[PDB]
PDB file of C-alpha atoms and ligand atoms in Angstrom:
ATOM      1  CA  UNK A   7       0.000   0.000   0.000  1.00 34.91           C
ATOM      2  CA  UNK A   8       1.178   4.009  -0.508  1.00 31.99           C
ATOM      3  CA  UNK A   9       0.039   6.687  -2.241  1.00 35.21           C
ATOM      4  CA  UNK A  10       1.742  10.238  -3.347  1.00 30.55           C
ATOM      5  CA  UNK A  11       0.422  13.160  -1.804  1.00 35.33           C
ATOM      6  CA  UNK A  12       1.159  16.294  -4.073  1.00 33.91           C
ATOM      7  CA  UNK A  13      -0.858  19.423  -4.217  1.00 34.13           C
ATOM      8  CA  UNK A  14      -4.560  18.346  -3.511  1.00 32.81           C
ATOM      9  CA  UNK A  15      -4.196  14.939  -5.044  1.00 32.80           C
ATOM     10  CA  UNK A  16      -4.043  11.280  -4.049  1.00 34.47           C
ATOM     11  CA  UNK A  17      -2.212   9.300  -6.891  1.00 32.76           C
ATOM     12  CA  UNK A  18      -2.802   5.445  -5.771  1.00 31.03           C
ATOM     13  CA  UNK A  19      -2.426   1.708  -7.501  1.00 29.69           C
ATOM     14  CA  UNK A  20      -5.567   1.734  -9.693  1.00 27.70           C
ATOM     15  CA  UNK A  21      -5.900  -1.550  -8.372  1.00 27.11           C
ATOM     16  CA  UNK A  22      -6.005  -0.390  -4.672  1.00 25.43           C
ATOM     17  CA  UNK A  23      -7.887   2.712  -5.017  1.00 25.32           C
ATOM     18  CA  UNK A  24     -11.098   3.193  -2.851  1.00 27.74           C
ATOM     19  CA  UNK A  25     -14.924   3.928  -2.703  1.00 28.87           C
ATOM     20  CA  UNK A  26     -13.572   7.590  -1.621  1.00 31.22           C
ATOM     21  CA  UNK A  27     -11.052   7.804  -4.271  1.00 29.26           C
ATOM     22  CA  UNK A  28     -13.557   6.661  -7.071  1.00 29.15           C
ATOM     23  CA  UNK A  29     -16.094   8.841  -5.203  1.00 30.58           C
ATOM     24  CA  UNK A  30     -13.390  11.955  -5.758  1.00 32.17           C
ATOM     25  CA  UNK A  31     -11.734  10.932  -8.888  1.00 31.31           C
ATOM     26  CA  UNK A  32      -9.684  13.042 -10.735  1.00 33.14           C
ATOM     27  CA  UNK A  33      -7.903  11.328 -13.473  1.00 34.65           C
ATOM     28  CA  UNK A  34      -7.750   7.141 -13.807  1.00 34.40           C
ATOM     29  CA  UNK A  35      -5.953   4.742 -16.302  1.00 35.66           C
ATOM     30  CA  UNK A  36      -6.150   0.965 -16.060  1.00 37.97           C
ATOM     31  CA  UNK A  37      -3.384   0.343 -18.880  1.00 41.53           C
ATOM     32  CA  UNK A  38      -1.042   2.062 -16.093  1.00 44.07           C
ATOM     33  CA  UNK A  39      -2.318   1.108 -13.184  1.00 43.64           C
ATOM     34  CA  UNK A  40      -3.087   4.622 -11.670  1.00 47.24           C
ATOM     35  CA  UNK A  41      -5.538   6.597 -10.246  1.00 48.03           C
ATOM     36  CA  UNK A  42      -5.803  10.078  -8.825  1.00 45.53           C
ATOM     37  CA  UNK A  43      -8.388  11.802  -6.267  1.00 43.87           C
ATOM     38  CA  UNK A  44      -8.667  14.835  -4.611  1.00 43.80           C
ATOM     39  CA  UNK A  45      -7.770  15.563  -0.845  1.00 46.29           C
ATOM     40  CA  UNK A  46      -8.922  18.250   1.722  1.00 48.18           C
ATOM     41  CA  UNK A  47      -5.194  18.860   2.995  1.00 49.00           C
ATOM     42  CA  UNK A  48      -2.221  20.058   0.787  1.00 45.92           C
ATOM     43  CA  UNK A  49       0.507  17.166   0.753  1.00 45.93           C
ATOM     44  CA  UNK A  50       4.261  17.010   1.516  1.00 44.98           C
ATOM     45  CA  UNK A  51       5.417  15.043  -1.781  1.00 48.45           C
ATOM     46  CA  UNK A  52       6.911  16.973  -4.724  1.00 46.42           C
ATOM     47  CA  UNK A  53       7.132  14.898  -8.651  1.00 45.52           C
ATOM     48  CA  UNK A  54      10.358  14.405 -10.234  1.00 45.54           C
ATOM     49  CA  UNK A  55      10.358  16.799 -13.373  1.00 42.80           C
ATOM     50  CA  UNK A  56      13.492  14.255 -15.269  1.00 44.53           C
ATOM     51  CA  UNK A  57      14.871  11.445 -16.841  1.00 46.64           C
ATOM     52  CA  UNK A  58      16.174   9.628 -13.849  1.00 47.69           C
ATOM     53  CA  UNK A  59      17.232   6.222 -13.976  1.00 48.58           C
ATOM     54  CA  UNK A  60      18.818   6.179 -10.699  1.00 47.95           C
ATOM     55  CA  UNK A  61      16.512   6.217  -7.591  1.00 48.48           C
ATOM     56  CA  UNK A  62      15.846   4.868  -4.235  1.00 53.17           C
ATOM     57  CA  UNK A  63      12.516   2.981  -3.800  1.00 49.65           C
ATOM     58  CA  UNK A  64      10.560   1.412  -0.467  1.00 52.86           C
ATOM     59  CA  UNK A  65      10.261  -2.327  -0.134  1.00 54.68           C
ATOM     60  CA  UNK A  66       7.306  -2.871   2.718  1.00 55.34           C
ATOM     61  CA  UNK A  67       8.165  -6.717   2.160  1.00 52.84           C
ATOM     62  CA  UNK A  68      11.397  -5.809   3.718  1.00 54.79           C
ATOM     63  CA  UNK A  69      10.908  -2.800   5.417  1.00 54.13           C
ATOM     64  CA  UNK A  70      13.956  -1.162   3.956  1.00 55.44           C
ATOM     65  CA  UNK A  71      14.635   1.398   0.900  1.00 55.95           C
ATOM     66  CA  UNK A  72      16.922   0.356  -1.934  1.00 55.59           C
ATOM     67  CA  UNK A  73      18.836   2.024  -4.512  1.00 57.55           C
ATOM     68  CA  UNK A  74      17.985   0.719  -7.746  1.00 58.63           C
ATOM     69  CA  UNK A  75      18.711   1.669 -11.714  1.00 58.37           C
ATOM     70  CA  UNK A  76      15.223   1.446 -13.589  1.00 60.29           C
ATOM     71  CA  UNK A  77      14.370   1.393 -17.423  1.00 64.48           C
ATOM     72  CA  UNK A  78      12.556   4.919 -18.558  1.00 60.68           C
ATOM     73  CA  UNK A  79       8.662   4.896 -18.866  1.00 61.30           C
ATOM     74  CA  UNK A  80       7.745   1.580 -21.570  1.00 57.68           C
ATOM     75  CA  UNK A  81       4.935  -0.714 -22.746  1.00 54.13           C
ATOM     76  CA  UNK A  82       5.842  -3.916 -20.990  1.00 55.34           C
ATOM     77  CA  UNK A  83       4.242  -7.416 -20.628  1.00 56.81           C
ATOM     78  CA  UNK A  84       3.621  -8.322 -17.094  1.00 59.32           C
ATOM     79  CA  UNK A  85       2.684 -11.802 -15.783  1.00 59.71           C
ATOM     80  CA  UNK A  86      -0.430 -12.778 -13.936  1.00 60.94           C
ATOM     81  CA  UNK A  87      -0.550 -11.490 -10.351  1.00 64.79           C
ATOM     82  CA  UNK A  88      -3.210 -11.771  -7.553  1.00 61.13           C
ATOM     83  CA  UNK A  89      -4.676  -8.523  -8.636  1.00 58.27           C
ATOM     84  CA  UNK A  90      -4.047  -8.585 -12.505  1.00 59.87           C
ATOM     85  CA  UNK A  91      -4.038 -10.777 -15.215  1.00 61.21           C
ATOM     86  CA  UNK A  92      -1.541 -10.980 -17.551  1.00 61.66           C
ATOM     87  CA  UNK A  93      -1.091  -8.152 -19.650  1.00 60.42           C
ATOM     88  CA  UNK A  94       0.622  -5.518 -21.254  1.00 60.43           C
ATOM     89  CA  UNK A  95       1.301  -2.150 -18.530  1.00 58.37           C
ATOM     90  CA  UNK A  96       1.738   0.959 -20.035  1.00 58.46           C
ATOM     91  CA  UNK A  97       4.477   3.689 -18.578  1.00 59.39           C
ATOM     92  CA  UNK A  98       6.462   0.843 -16.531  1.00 61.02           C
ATOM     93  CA  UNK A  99       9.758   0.745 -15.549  1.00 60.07           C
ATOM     94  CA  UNK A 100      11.791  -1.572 -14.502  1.00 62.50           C
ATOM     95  CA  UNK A 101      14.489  -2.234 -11.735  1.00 61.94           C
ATOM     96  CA  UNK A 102      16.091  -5.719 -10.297  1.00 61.79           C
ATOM     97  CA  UNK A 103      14.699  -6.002  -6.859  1.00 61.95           C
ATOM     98  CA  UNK A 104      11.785  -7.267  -4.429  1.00 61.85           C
ATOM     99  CA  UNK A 105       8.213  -6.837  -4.952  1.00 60.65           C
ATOM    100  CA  UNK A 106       5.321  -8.615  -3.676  1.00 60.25           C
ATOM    101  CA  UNK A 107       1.946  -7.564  -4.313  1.00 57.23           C
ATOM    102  CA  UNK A 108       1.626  -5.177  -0.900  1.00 56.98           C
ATOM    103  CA  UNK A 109       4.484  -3.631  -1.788  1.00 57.32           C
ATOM    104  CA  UNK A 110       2.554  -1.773  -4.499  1.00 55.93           C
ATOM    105  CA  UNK A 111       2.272   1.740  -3.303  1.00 59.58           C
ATOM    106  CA  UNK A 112       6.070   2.240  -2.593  1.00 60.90           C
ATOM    107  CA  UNK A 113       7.783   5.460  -3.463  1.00 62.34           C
ATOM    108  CA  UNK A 114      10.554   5.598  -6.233  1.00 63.65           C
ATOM    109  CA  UNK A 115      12.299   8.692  -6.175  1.00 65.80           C
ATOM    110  CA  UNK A 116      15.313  10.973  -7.364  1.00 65.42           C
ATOM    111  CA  UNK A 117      16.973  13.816  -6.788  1.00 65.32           C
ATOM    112  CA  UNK A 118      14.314  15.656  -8.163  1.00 63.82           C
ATOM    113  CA  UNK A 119      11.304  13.646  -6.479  1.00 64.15           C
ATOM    114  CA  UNK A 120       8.714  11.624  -6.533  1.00 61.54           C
ATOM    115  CA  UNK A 121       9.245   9.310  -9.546  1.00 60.94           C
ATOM    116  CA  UNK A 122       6.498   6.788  -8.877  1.00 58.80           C
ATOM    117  CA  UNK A 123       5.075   4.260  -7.324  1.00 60.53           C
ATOM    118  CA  UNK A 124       5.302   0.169  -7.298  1.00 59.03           C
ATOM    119  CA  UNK A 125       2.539  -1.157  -9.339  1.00 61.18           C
ATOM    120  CA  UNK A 126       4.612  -4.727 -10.428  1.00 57.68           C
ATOM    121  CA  UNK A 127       6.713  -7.609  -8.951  1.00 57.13           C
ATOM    122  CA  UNK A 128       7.663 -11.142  -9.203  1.00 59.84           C
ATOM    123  CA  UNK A 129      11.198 -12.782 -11.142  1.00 56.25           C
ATOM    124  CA  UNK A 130      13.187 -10.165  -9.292  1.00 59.62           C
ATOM    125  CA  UNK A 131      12.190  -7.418 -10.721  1.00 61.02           C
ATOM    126  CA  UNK A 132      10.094  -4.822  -9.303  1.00 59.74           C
ATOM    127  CA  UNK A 133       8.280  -2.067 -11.761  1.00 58.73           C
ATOM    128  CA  UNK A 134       7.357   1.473 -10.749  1.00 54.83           C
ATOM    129  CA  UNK A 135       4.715   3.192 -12.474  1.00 57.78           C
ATOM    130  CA  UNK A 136       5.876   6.706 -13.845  1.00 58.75           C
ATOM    131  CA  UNK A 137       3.754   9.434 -12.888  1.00 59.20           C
ATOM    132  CA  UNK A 138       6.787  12.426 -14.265  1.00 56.34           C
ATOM    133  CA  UNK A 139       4.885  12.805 -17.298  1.00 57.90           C
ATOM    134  CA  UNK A 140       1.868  13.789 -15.385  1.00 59.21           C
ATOM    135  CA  UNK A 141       2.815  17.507 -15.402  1.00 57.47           C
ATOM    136  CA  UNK A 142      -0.780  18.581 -14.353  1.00 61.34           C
ATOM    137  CA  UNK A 143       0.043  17.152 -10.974  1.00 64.16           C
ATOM    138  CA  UNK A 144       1.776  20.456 -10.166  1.00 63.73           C
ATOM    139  CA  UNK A 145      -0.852  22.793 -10.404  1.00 61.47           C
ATOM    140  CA  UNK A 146      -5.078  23.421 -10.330  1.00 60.49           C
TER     141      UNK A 146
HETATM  142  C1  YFN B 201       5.740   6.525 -25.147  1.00 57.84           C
HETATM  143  C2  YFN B 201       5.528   5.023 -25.089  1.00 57.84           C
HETATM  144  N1  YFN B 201       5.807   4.462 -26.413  1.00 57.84           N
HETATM  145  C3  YFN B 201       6.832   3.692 -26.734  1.00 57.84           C
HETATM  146  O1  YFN B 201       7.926   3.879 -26.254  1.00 57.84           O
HETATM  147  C4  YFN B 201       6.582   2.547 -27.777  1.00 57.84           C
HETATM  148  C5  YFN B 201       5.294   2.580 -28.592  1.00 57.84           C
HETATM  149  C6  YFN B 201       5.453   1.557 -27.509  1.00 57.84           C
HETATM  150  C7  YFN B 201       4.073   4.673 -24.929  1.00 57.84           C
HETATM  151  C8  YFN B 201       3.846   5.147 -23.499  1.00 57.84           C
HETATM  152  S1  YFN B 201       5.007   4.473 -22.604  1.00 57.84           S
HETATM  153  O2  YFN B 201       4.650   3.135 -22.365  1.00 57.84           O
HETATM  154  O3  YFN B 201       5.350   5.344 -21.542  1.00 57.84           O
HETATM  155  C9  YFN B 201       6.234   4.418 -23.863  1.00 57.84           C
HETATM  156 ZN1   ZN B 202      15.333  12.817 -11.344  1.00 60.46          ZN
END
């Protein structure tokens, strides 16, 4: 579980978004595994604005943060997990590491900031959904 709190927006797993988030949606894509809602309170995360591909992301598995180099934002296959089937994720990257399905929600992030979130595991990799590109998170 996690979430990014930026501005007066929520940006959760698709897949673990709730009846308040739907209820308050702002912006959702299945293909990427996000979804965005609207908060009362201002939050305390700021978005990369880069091309990172060097980052540190949270592992709840393990309890521990890793430093990781991840592939830039592609259309990748993923396998079956418990809460997808197998299919093709759009804006994924990739890094080698641990993920298990309640570790979606982590925070990767830069220098910069918040690059995204873990939406993918299994095979030792772990893949991060990008939400950089989402420039509209900055403002309104
Ligand atoms: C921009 C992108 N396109 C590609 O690179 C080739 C066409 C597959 C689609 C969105 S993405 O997945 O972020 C990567
Ligand atoms: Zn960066």
């Amino acid at each position: 579980s996690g979430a990014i709190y930026v501005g007066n927006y929520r940006v959760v797993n698709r897949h673990l978004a709730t009846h308040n988030d739907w209820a308050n949606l702002v912006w959702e894509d299945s293909s990427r595994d996000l979804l965005v809602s609207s908060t009362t309170a201002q939050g305390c995360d700021t978005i990369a604005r880069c091309d990172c591909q060097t980052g540190v992301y949270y592992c709840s598995s393990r309890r521990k943060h890793y430093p990781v180099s991840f592939s830039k934002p592609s259309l990748i296959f993923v396998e079956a997990s418990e809460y997808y089937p197998a299919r093709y994720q759009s804006h994924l990257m990739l890094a080698v590491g641990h993920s298990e399905p309640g570790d979606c929600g982590g925070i990767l992030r830069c220098q910069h900031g918040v690059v995204g979130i873990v939406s993918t595991g299994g095979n030792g990799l772990v893949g991060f959904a990008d939400v950089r590109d989402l420039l509209w998170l900055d403002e309104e």
